[PDB]
Amino acid sequence: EYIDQGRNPQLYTKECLERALAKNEQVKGKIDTMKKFKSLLIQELSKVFPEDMAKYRSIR
């Protein structure tokens, strides 16, 4: 159906590349947000049990 209208596939490949890049960017965004949320919750409650945090940091 893309050939039916009549257009070179270079524009379609550009659109596929840009939409895949957008999906990659939003996946990177969600990944870094959950990572920073994990880091802030870890450092926020470092005082509840120091031994538990020490074991968590050692095991990682």
């Binding site: 039916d4 009549g6 257009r7 070179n8 596939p9 270079q10 524009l11 490949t13 550009k14 590349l17 840009e18 895949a20 890049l21 990659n24 996946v27 990177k28 990944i31 074991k55 095991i59």
Partner: protein, 74 residues
């Protein structure tokens, strides 16, 4: 001492969705290129039942033939 039901976490960085999947999959230079061919086609010819051809493609005796049919010049 040990907590109940601790286990081993997986290998530190295996294949994830956090890597750059395109650059790992060797597709970078095509994107850096990319980011009408009818027109490309148009340059070769003139312009670009086009209703009929699509329908035919939707579903998906050369010498003797010439001798059989004769078309008046005028």
């Amino acid at each position: 001492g040990p907590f109940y039901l601790m286990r081993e976490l997986p290998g530190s960085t295996e294949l994830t969705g956090s890597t750059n999947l395109i650059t790992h999959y060797n597709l970078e230079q095509a994107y850096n290129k990319f980011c009408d061919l009818p027109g490309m086609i148009d340059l070769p010819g003139s312009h670009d039942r086009s209703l009929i051809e699509k329908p035919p493609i939707l579903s998906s005796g050369t010498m003797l033939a010439g001798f059989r049919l004769h078309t008046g010049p005028l």
